[PDB]
């Protein structure tokens, strides 16, 4: 088709992130940090590095500086598997609450069956991509 | 809702970009560079800095290093308005061809009326976001 789908989506995702970044600044989480912690939070327990980078859609080595920092601030433990600490729990719970609440306002006036099709479509687009 | 829409989209967009990045590496365009040139290309002629950052969904100062480089390699001219040069034309045309062609393969088996709803939905999501 003619329509610039990938850059429409890429803009949307940038402005949605930027809204969240603003709302989370008091927590002085940077983008990369909350993105990565959120991702850890929505995965099941004990992810390998490799599962995490994949769920994010990035390549490990970029993941590693971000993880190293989080480990430095004691947010995260590794023994290569990944566990949120006791110490990150209040920070996470408040982060997730702002993210959840922002999603409810973003999703306002969009029907569940419309959101359900978006999700199934995202899936197919990604499958095409991975198949290449 | 419960569903992690923003990170689904953010993954999709990361893996779609990464596919394009791979395909464009022979041209040794970096991500930021092709993203920005593509954006310039799909806009009407002579954008201000400000229109460009907005179409991308970023804030000007990040835009500026990238533009400075492009101007250094003679891809781009400014007099604060922005014009692709004569010299960038073959590079652009080949870039756009790879992007266009990648979109056709990504969009395979998805109906036009389904792609048309995605586009209208992206629009509404962004409007909610800007309204905040
Ligand atoms: O601008 C982007 O980030 C982008 C991402 C995927 C496809 C096309 C694009 O312009
Ligand atoms: O792009 C990155 O470097 C990155 C690193 C960690 C988490 C999310 C990210 O996009
Ligand atoms: O909607 C707001 O005003 C807001 C501000 C910060 C965090 C979550 C929010 O909903
Ligand atoms: O992971 C992201 O980049 C992201 C972007 C917007 C909303 C939620 C997210 O996790
Ligand atoms: O995030 C950036 O710094 C950036 C800069 C120029 C173009 C696209 C971008 O995402
Ligand atoms: O599909 C491919 O093999 C390909 C490779 C590079 C550029 C555009 C493409 O379609």
mmCIF file of N, CA and C in Angstrom, chain A residues 1-19 23 35 38-39 42 54-59 100 103-110 112 114-115 117-119 121-122 124-130 132, chain B residues 1-19 23 35 38-39 42 54-59 100 103-110 112 114-115 117-119 121-122 124-130 132:
data_model
loop_
_atom_site.group_PDB
_atom_site.id
_atom_site.type_symbol
_atom_site.label_atom_id
_atom_site.label_comp_id
_atom_site.label_asym_id
_atom_site.label_seq_id
_atom_site.Cartn_x
_atom_site.Cartn_y
_atom_site.Cartn_z
ATOM 1 N N UNK A 1 0.837 -1.232 0.000
ATOM 2 C CA UNK A 1 0.000 0.000 0.000
ATOM 3 C C UNK A 1 0.863 1.270 0.000
ATOM 4 N N UNK A 2 0.182 2.411 -0.038
ATOM 5 C CA UNK A 2 0.826 3.700 -0.171
ATOM 6 C C UNK A 2 1.117 4.208 1.234
ATOM 7 N N UNK A 3 0.276 3.814 2.189
ATOM 8 C CA UNK A 3 0.185 4.500 3.474
ATOM 9 C C UNK A 3 1.341 4.151 4.418
ATOM 10 N N UNK A 4 1.830 5.187 5.085
ATOM 11 C CA UNK A 4 3.094 5.140 5.796
ATOM 12 C C UNK A 4 2.856 4.543 7.176
ATOM 13 N N UNK A 5 2.421 3.292 7.213
ATOM 14 C CA UNK A 5 2.017 2.675 8.448
ATOM 15 C C UNK A 5 3.124 2.669 9.512
ATOM 16 N N UNK A 6 4.374 2.383 9.137
ATOM 17 C CA UNK A 6 5.410 2.100 10.110
ATOM 18 C C UNK A 6 5.765 3.388 10.841
ATOM 19 N N UNK A 7 5.796 4.494 10.138
ATOM 20 C CA UNK A 7 6.064 5.771 10.770
ATOM 21 C C UNK A 7 4.882 6.373 11.518
ATOM 22 N N UNK A 8 3.647 6.064 11.105
ATOM 23 C CA UNK A 8 2.501 6.371 11.939
ATOM 24 C C UNK A 8 2.651 5.673 13.290
ATOM 25 N N UNK A 9 2.900 4.384 13.289
ATOM 26 C CA UNK A 9 3.006 3.650 14.532
ATOM 27 C C UNK A 9 4.191 4.173 15.352
ATOM 28 N N UNK A 10 5.297 4.518 14.690
ATOM 29 C CA UNK A 10 6.535 4.872 15.366
ATOM 30 C C UNK A 10 6.356 6.221 16.100
ATOM 31 N N UNK A 11 5.790 7.225 15.446
ATOM 32 C CA UNK A 11 5.298 8.432 16.095
ATOM 33 C C UNK A 11 4.404 8.200 17.314
ATOM 34 N N UNK A 12 3.401 7.352 17.136
ATOM 35 C CA UNK A 12 2.434 7.107 18.201
ATOM 36 C C UNK A 12 3.155 6.616 19.439
ATOM 37 N N UNK A 13 4.054 5.680 19.187
ATOM 38 C CA UNK A 13 4.779 5.032 20.241
ATOM 39 C C UNK A 13 5.740 6.011 20.906
ATOM 40 N N UNK A 14 6.320 6.922 20.135
ATOM 41 C CA UNK A 14 7.215 7.953 20.678
ATOM 42 C C UNK A 14 6.443 8.949 21.566
ATOM 43 N N UNK A 15 5.326 9.482 21.084
ATOM 44 C CA UNK A 15 4.507 10.366 21.888
ATOM 45 C C UNK A 15 3.852 9.702 23.103
ATOM 46 N N UNK A 16 3.641 8.397 23.088
ATOM 47 C CA UNK A 16 3.028 7.721 24.205
ATOM 48 C C UNK A 16 4.099 7.509 25.249
ATOM 49 N N UNK A 17 5.270 7.135 24.783
ATOM 50 C CA UNK A 17 6.402 7.044 25.694
ATOM 51 C C UNK A 17 6.715 8.392 26.334
ATOM 52 N N UNK A 18 6.544 9.491 25.592
ATOM 53 C CA UNK A 18 7.067 10.766 26.055
ATOM 54 C C UNK A 18 6.121 11.196 27.180
ATOM 55 N N UNK A 19 4.820 10.981 26.972
ATOM 56 C CA UNK A 19 3.811 11.208 28.017
ATOM 57 C C UNK A 19 4.150 10.443 29.291
ATOM 58 N N UNK A 23 5.309 11.981 33.100
ATOM 59 C CA UNK A 23 4.654 11.527 34.314
ATOM 60 C C UNK A 23 5.533 10.776 35.282
ATOM 61 N N UNK A 35 11.265 1.443 30.904
ATOM 62 C CA UNK A 35 10.899 0.544 29.813
ATOM 63 C C UNK A 35 11.368 -0.824 30.157
ATOM 64 N N UNK A 38 9.501 -2.176 33.472
ATOM 65 C CA UNK A 38 8.165 -2.540 33.090
ATOM 66 C C UNK A 38 8.191 -3.887 32.377
ATOM 67 N N UNK A 39 9.086 -4.025 31.396
ATOM 68 C CA UNK A 39 9.218 -5.281 30.683
ATOM 69 C C UNK A 39 9.551 -6.442 31.590
ATOM 70 N N UNK A 42 6.311 -7.331 33.433
ATOM 71 C CA UNK A 42 5.225 -8.051 32.786
ATOM 72 C C UNK A 42 5.579 -9.457 32.306
ATOM 73 N N UNK A 54 14.493 -9.996 23.826
ATOM 74 C CA UNK A 54 13.526 -10.399 22.807
ATOM 75 C C UNK A 54 12.162 -9.810 23.091
ATOM 76 N N UNK A 55 11.744 -9.807 24.356
ATOM 77 C CA UNK A 55 10.434 -9.256 24.664
ATOM 78 C C UNK A 55 10.464 -7.748 24.388
ATOM 79 N N UNK A 56 11.636 -7.123 24.564
ATOM 80 C CA UNK A 56 11.733 -5.685 24.319
ATOM 81 C C UNK A 56 11.774 -5.444 22.803
ATOM 82 N N UNK A 57 12.346 -6.389 22.053
ATOM 83 C CA UNK A 57 12.723 -6.170 20.646
ATOM 84 C C UNK A 57 14.042 -5.436 20.431
ATOM 85 N N UNK A 58 15.036 -5.744 21.249
ATOM 86 C CA UNK A 58 16.365 -5.188 21.046
ATOM 87 C C UNK A 58 17.400 -6.307 21.168
ATOM 88 N N UNK A 59 18.657 -5.955 20.886
ATOM 89 C CA UNK A 59 19.797 -6.893 20.935
ATOM 90 C C UNK A 59 20.563 -6.782 22.247
ATOM 91 N N UNK A 100 -0.537 1.870 33.790
ATOM 92 C CA UNK A 100 -1.933 1.380 33.766
ATOM 93 C C UNK A 100 -2.968 2.482 33.606
ATOM 94 N N UNK A 103 -2.707 4.212 30.270
ATOM 95 C CA UNK A 103 -3.312 3.395 29.238
ATOM 96 C C UNK A 103 -4.826 3.555 29.210
ATOM 97 N N UNK A 104 -5.470 3.518 30.384
ATOM 98 C CA UNK A 104 -6.929 3.785 30.486
ATOM 99 C C UNK A 104 -7.299 5.112 29.861
ATOM 100 N N UNK A 105 -6.582 6.191 30.169
ATOM 101 C CA UNK A 105 -6.898 7.432 29.461
ATOM 102 C C UNK A 105 -6.570 7.418 27.948
ATOM 103 N N UNK A 106 -5.527 6.716 27.525
ATOM 104 C CA UNK A 106 -5.227 6.660 26.092
ATOM 105 C C UNK A 106 -6.332 5.887 25.343
ATOM 106 N N UNK A 107 -6.916 4.902 26.022
ATOM 107 C CA UNK A 107 -7.799 3.936 25.391
ATOM 108 C C UNK A 107 -9.268 4.366 25.413
ATOM 109 N N UNK A 108 -9.513 5.529 26.012
ATOM 110 C CA UNK A 108 -10.830 6.166 26.177
ATOM 111 C C UNK A 108 -11.634 6.320 24.894
ATOM 112 N N UNK A 109 -12.769 5.625 24.803
ATOM 113 C CA UNK A 109 -13.671 5.782 23.650
ATOM 114 C C UNK A 109 -13.297 4.824 22.545
ATOM 115 N N UNK A 110 -12.498 3.843 22.927
ATOM 116 C CA UNK A 110 -12.149 2.809 21.980
ATOM 117 C C UNK A 110 -12.714 1.557 22.604
ATOM 118 N N UNK A 112 -13.583 -2.340 23.382
ATOM 119 C CA UNK A 112 -12.833 -3.551 23.569
ATOM 120 C C UNK A 112 -12.610 -4.404 22.326
ATOM 121 N N UNK A 114 -12.513 -3.438 19.174
ATOM 122 C CA UNK A 114 -11.469 -2.703 18.473
ATOM 123 C C UNK A 114 -10.053 -2.845 19.070
ATOM 124 N N UNK A 115 -9.923 -2.916 20.395
ATOM 125 C CA UNK A 115 -8.590 -3.071 20.996
ATOM 126 C C UNK A 115 -8.108 -4.496 20.812
ATOM 127 N N UNK A 117 -8.941 -6.375 18.176
ATOM 128 C CA UNK A 117 -8.361 -6.507 16.842
ATOM 129 C C UNK A 117 -6.941 -5.884 16.708
ATOM 130 N N UNK A 118 -6.697 -4.710 17.285
ATOM 131 C CA UNK A 118 -5.344 -4.101 17.288
ATOM 132 C C UNK A 118 -4.354 -5.130 17.798
ATOM 133 N N UNK A 119 -4.633 -5.728 18.937
ATOM 134 C CA UNK A 119 -3.708 -6.714 19.453
ATOM 135 C C UNK A 119 -3.473 -7.877 18.527
ATOM 136 N N UNK A 121 -3.779 -7.945 15.269
ATOM 137 C CA UNK A 121 -3.045 -7.359 14.151
ATOM 138 C C UNK A 121 -1.541 -7.071 14.426
ATOM 139 N N UNK A 122 -1.237 -6.514 15.591
ATOM 140 C CA UNK A 122 0.149 -6.332 16.053
ATOM 141 C C UNK A 122 0.894 -7.658 15.962
ATOM 142 N N UNK A 124 0.216 -10.382 14.080
ATOM 143 C CA UNK A 124 0.436 -10.785 12.697
ATOM 144 C C UNK A 124 1.528 -9.947 12.046
ATOM 145 N N UNK A 125 1.516 -8.640 12.269
ATOM 146 C CA UNK A 125 2.579 -7.791 11.740
ATOM 147 C C UNK A 125 3.951 -8.282 12.224
ATOM 148 N N UNK A 126 4.099 -8.539 13.511
ATOM 149 C CA UNK A 126 5.352 -9.064 14.037
ATOM 150 C C UNK A 126 5.737 -10.432 13.449
ATOM 151 N N UNK A 127 4.771 -11.337 13.321
ATOM 152 C CA UNK A 127 5.032 -12.618 12.684
ATOM 153 C C UNK A 127 5.509 -12.387 11.257
ATOM 154 N N UNK A 128 4.845 -11.520 10.505
ATOM 155 C CA UNK A 128 5.406 -11.291 9.195
ATOM 156 C C UNK A 128 6.854 -10.841 9.359
ATOM 157 N N UNK A 129 7.123 -9.896 10.260
ATOM 158 C CA UNK A 129 8.460 -9.337 10.342
ATOM 159 C C UNK A 129 9.475 -10.458 10.627
ATOM 160 N N UNK A 130 9.200 -11.328 11.586
ATOM 161 C CA UNK A 130 10.176 -12.301 12.018
ATOM 162 C C UNK A 130 10.432 -13.292 10.879
ATOM 163 N N UNK A 132 10.338 -12.429 8.103
ATOM 164 C CA UNK A 132 11.128 -11.568 7.222
ATOM 165 C C UNK A 132 10.408 -11.242 5.913
ATOM 166 N N UNK B 1 -8.069 -1.178 30.350
ATOM 167 C CA UNK B 1 -7.951 -2.648 30.140
ATOM 168 C C UNK B 1 -6.668 -3.209 30.768
ATOM 169 N N UNK B 2 -6.513 -4.524 30.652
ATOM 170 C CA UNK B 2 -5.431 -5.242 31.291
ATOM 171 C C UNK B 2 -4.266 -5.268 30.312
ATOM 172 N N UNK B 3 -4.583 -5.257 29.018
ATOM 173 C CA UNK B 3 -3.634 -5.660 27.984
ATOM 174 C C UNK B 3 -2.586 -4.581 27.685
ATOM 175 N N UNK B 4 -1.356 -5.050 27.522
ATOM 176 C CA UNK B 4 -0.182 -4.196 27.525
ATOM 177 C C UNK B 4 0.003 -3.616 26.130
ATOM 178 N N UNK B 5 -0.963 -2.830 25.682
ATOM 179 C CA UNK B 5 -0.973 -2.349 24.326
ATOM 180 C C UNK B 5 0.291 -1.559 23.957
ATOM 181 N N UNK B 6 0.792 -0.694 24.844
ATOM 182 C CA UNK B 6 1.810 0.268 24.473
ATOM 183 C C UNK B 6 3.120 -0.470 24.229
ATOM 184 N N UNK B 7 3.408 -1.470 25.026
ATOM 185 C CA UNK B 7 4.605 -2.262 24.823
ATOM 186 C C UNK B 7 4.508 -3.287 23.701
ATOM 187 N N UNK B 8 3.303 -3.785 23.398
ATOM 188 C CA UNK B 8 3.110 -4.535 22.172
ATOM 189 C C UNK B 8 3.487 -3.663 20.976
ATOM 190 N N UNK B 9 2.941 -2.471 20.890
ATOM 191 C CA UNK B 9 3.215 -1.612 19.759
ATOM 192 C C UNK B 9 4.705 -1.251 19.722
ATOM 193 N N UNK B 10 5.316 -1.029 20.887
ATOM 194 C CA UNK B 10 6.677 -0.522 20.972
ATOM 195 C C UNK B 10 7.663 -1.604 20.474
ATOM 196 N N UNK B 11 7.517 -2.844 20.919
ATOM 197 C CA UNK B 11 8.171 -3.997 20.318
ATOM 198 C C UNK B 11 8.038 -4.105 18.798
ATOM 199 N N UNK B 12 6.807 -3.995 18.322
ATOM 200 C CA UNK B 12 6.541 -4.158 16.896
ATOM 201 C C UNK B 12 7.362 -3.157 16.109
ATOM 202 N N UNK B 13 7.325 -1.936 16.614
ATOM 203 C CA UNK B 13 7.972 -0.835 15.961
ATOM 204 C C UNK B 13 9.487 -0.995 16.022
ATOM 205 N N UNK B 14 10.004 -1.544 17.114
ATOM 206 C CA UNK B 14 11.443 -1.802 17.254
ATOM 207 C C UNK B 14 11.910 -2.899 16.278
ATOM 208 N N UNK B 15 11.216 -4.032 16.229
ATOM 209 C CA UNK B 15 11.548 -5.076 15.283
ATOM 210 C C UNK B 15 11.334 -4.699 13.813
ATOM 211 N N UNK B 16 10.464 -3.753 13.511
ATOM 212 C CA UNK B 16 10.224 -3.358 12.145
ATOM 213 C C UNK B 16 11.340 -2.424 11.740
ATOM 214 N N UNK B 17 11.693 -1.545 12.653
ATOM 215 C CA UNK B 17 12.851 -0.697 12.413
ATOM 216 C C UNK B 17 14.122 -1.521 12.237
ATOM 217 N N UNK B 18 14.251 -2.634 12.967
ATOM 218 C CA UNK B 18 15.536 -3.311 13.033
ATOM 219 C C UNK B 18 15.688 -4.004 11.676
ATOM 220 N N UNK B 19 14.591 -4.582 11.181
ATOM 221 C CA UNK B 19 14.549 -5.156 9.829
ATOM 222 C C UNK B 19 14.979 -4.137 8.779
ATOM 223 N N UNK B 23 18.477 -4.135 6.335
ATOM 224 C CA UNK B 23 18.379 -3.930 4.900
ATOM 225 C C UNK B 23 19.031 -2.672 4.380
ATOM 226 N N UNK B 35 15.581 7.414 9.426
ATOM 227 C CA UNK B 35 14.302 7.770 10.036
ATOM 228 C C UNK B 35 14.029 9.203 9.749
ATOM 229 N N UNK B 38 13.648 9.812 5.776
ATOM 230 C CA UNK B 38 12.360 9.308 5.389
ATOM 231 C C UNK B 38 11.283 10.307 5.795
ATOM 232 N N UNK B 39 11.328 10.756 7.051
ATOM 233 C CA UNK B 39 10.372 11.740 7.523
ATOM 234 C C UNK B 39 10.399 13.020 6.721
ATOM 235 N N UNK B 42 8.628 12.251 3.410
ATOM 236 C CA UNK B 42 7.182 12.134 3.316
ATOM 237 C C UNK B 42 6.406 13.401 3.673
ATOM 238 N N UNK B 54 7.956 17.400 15.217
ATOM 239 C CA UNK B 54 6.582 17.028 15.550
ATOM 240 C C UNK B 54 6.128 15.839 14.734
ATOM 241 N N UNK B 55 6.468 15.810 13.446
ATOM 242 C CA UNK B 55 6.042 14.684 12.629
ATOM 243 C C UNK B 55 6.762 13.425 13.125
ATOM 244 N N UNK B 56 7.983 13.591 13.650
ATOM 245 C CA UNK B 56 8.724 12.430 14.141
ATOM 246 C C UNK B 56 8.142 12.010 15.497
ATOM 247 N N UNK B 57 7.637 12.977 16.268
ATOM 248 C CA UNK B 57 7.322 12.779 17.693
ATOM 249 C C UNK B 57 8.511 12.874 18.642
ATOM 250 N N UNK B 58 9.411 13.809 18.379
ATOM 251 C CA UNK B 58 10.515 14.057 19.294
ATOM 252 C C UNK B 58 10.652 15.564 19.516
ATOM 253 N N UNK B 59 11.555 15.926 20.431
ATOM 254 C CA UNK B 59 11.828 17.332 20.795
ATOM 255 C C UNK B 59 13.048 17.877 20.065
ATOM 256 N N UNK B 100 9.283 1.002 1.240
ATOM 257 C CA UNK B 100 8.060 0.627 0.497
ATOM 258 C C UNK B 100 7.894 -0.872 0.305
ATOM 259 N N UNK B 103 7.392 -2.682 3.571
ATOM 260 C CA UNK B 103 6.027 -2.517 4.025
ATOM 261 C C UNK B 103 5.082 -3.490 3.333
ATOM 262 N N UNK B 104 5.203 -3.626 2.006
ATOM 263 C CA UNK B 104 4.418 -4.634 1.247
ATOM 264 C C UNK B 104 4.597 -6.025 1.816
ATOM 265 N N UNK B 105 5.828 -6.459 2.078
ATOM 266 C CA UNK B 105 5.955 -7.763 2.732
ATOM 267 C C UNK B 105 5.426 -7.815 4.185
ATOM 268 N N UNK B 106 5.533 -6.733 4.945
ATOM 269 C CA UNK B 106 5.002 -6.754 6.311
ATOM 270 C C UNK B 106 3.463 -6.855 6.285
ATOM 271 N N UNK B 107 2.858 -6.263 5.257
ATOM 272 C CA UNK B 107 1.419 -6.065 5.209
ATOM 273 C C UNK B 107 0.678 -7.226 4.540
ATOM 274 N N UNK B 108 1.450 -8.214 4.095
ATOM 275 C CA UNK B 108 0.997 -9.437 3.411
ATOM 276 C C UNK B 108 -0.088 -10.215 4.141
ATOM 277 N N UNK B 109 -1.282 -10.290 3.550
ATOM 278 C CA UNK B 109 -2.368 -11.105 4.121
ATOM 279 C C UNK B 109 -3.187 -10.294 5.095
ATOM 280 N N UNK B 110 -3.005 -8.989 5.001
ATOM 281 C CA UNK B 110 -3.806 -8.104 5.816
ATOM 282 C C UNK B 110 -4.573 -7.293 4.801
ATOM 283 N N UNK B 112 -6.934 -4.463 3.077
ATOM 284 C CA UNK B 112 -7.008 -3.029 3.088
ATOM 285 C C UNK B 112 -7.939 -2.411 4.124
ATOM 286 N N UNK B 114 -8.883 -3.656 7.028
ATOM 287 C CA UNK B 114 -8.117 -3.793 8.259
ATOM 288 C C UNK B 114 -6.950 -2.797 8.419
ATOM 289 N N UNK B 115 -6.252 -2.452 7.336
ATOM 290 C CA UNK B 115 -5.146 -1.490 7.450
ATOM 291 C C UNK B 115 -5.699 -0.089 7.612
ATOM 292 N N UNK B 117 -8.593 0.558 9.158
ATOM 293 C CA UNK B 117 -8.928 0.771 10.563
ATOM 294 C C UNK B 117 -7.693 1.026 11.475
ATOM 295 N N UNK B 118 -6.596 0.295 11.290
ATOM 296 C CA UNK B 118 -5.346 0.547 12.049
ATOM 297 C C UNK B 118 -5.000 2.018 11.931
ATOM 298 N N UNK B 119 -4.960 2.537 10.722
ATOM 299 C CA UNK B 119 -4.630 3.938 10.574
ATOM 300 C C UNK B 119 -5.569 4.868 11.293
ATOM 301 N N UNK B 121 -7.409 4.226 13.923
ATOM 302 C CA UNK B 121 -7.138 3.972 15.335
ATOM 303 C C UNK B 121 -5.832 4.614 15.883
ATOM 304 N N UNK B 122 -4.747 4.516 15.124
ATOM 305 C CA UNK B 122 -3.487 5.209 15.438
ATOM 306 C C UNK B 122 -3.763 6.690 15.666
ATOM 307 N N UNK B 124 -6.650 8.235 16.504
ATOM 308 C CA UNK B 124 -7.403 8.462 17.731
ATOM 309 C C UNK B 124 -6.523 8.276 18.959
ATOM 310 N N UNK B 125 -5.698 7.238 18.975
ATOM 311 C CA UNK B 125 -4.772 7.047 20.086
ATOM 312 C C UNK B 125 -3.882 8.286 20.265
ATOM 313 N N UNK B 126 -3.294 8.786 19.193
ATOM 314 C CA UNK B 126 -2.482 9.994 19.271
ATOM 315 C C UNK B 126 -3.269 11.229 19.742
ATOM 316 N N UNK B 127 -4.483 11.413 19.232
ATOM 317 C CA UNK B 127 -5.329 12.501 19.698
ATOM 318 C C UNK B 127 -5.579 12.344 21.191
ATOM 319 N N UNK B 128 -5.914 11.148 21.650
ATOM 320 C CA UNK B 128 -6.052 11.058 23.084
ATOM 321 C C UNK B 128 -4.747 11.519 23.727
ATOM 322 N N UNK B 129 -3.602 11.041 23.240
ATOM 323 C CA UNK B 129 -2.352 11.338 23.916
ATOM 324 C C UNK B 129 -2.149 12.861 23.987
ATOM 325 N N UNK B 130 -2.345 13.575 22.890
ATOM 326 C CA UNK B 130 -2.015 14.981 22.841
ATOM 327 C C UNK B 130 -2.948 15.747 23.781
ATOM 328 N N UNK B 132 -3.895 14.540 26.252
ATOM 329 C CA UNK B 132 -3.318 14.131 27.533
ATOM 330 C C UNK B 132 -4.265 13.254 28.355
#
